[PDB]
Design a protein around this ligand. Structure first.
Ligand SMILES: C=CC1=C(C)C(=O)N/C1=C\C1=NC(=C\c2[nH]c(/C=C3\NC(=O)C(CC)=C3C)c(C)c2CCC(=O)O)/C(CCC(=O)O)=C1C
Length: 243
């Protein structure tokens, strides 16, 4: 899991660095095993007519989390990206943890984090609603409205442009807080009925299908690797539909 030997880390936006370290710290002592991505993917680079895209992939699994994926990326010199999803094992009915950070020379442009529902009623489990409410409403000066496919995210979803360092740190700490809640709930979660497992499975499939509608990600991938490679990456590596 260690980020100390990452070639990208030293060159990424500081907020992305802190988030990557936080996520790695949350996962480090779990009962991890490797999760083999398609073609045993780790590092990948590509270029067509413009800038090069470089991606480093780390991916694990535990009994509660089917797939725990941390991706770090850079387009050319200046655009940095962090992607992370923890895909739950439907048996336990846990929500989906996700975060996405995009940064350029002007600073972080997008910071998104959520614990996303998998229940058919589109609500988080009661224990999560309670814990998340207790954190209080965070103040951020530059909130961004989610795109329509973003109906999958919970009412606790953050989507901002950080205005300053105070806000960058407040966002990172809130993701820490999400992870702490999530890891704890994973150990207390009652395993579920076959019908309930099916319900949660469908929520996760819908989440992936909706995430694949993000043309921001797709355009970045297509400009470095082309349409076919991007469709494979989005549907097989990033947001794989379990089935
Ligand atoms: C948990 C949520 C979540 C996960 C897990 C996730 O992967 N994305 C997620 C969310 C989400 N991301 C968004 C934006 C962008 N994403 C990238 C690119 C990548 N993001 C990547 O992960 C990778 C592979 C490394 C690339 C290449 C770019 C360039 C932007 C534009 C940045 C900006 O406008 O300032 C938006 C706003 C969408 C919109 O405005 O229409 C939302 C909602």
């Amino acid at each position: 899991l260690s980020l100390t030997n990452s070639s990208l880390m030293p060159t990424l936006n500081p907020m992305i660095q802190q988030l990557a370290l936080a996520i790695a710290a949350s996962w480090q002592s779990l009962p991890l095993k490797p999760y083999q991505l398609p073609e045993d993917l780790g590092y990948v680079e590509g270029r067509l007519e413009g800038e090069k895209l470089v991606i480093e992939n780390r991916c694990y699994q535990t009994p509660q989390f089917r797939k725990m994926h941390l991706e770090l990326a850079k387009v050319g010199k200046g655009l940095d990206i962090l992607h992370c999803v923890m895909f739950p094992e439907p048996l336990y009915g846990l929500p989906l943890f996700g975060c996405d950070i995009v940064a350029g020379p002007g600073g972080v442009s997008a910071a998104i984090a959520d614990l996303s529902p998998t229940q058919s009623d589109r609500q988080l489990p009661a224990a999560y609603q309670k814990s998340l409410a207790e954190l209080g409403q965070p103040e951020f000066e530059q909130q961004r409205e989610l795109p329509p496919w973003g109906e999958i995210f919970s009412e606790y979803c953050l989507f901002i442009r950080p205005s300053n360092v105070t806000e960058e740190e407040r966002f990172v700490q809130r993701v820490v807080d999400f992870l702490q809640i999530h890891c704890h709930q994973s150990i207390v979660a009652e395993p579920l009925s076959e019908a309930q497992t099916l319900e949660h499975r469908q929520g996760q499939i819908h989440y992936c299908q909706q995430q694949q509608k993000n043309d921001k990600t797709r355009r970045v991938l297509e400009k470095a690797f082309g349409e076919a490679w991007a469709e494979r990456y989005m549907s097989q590596v990033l947001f794989d539909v379990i089935q």
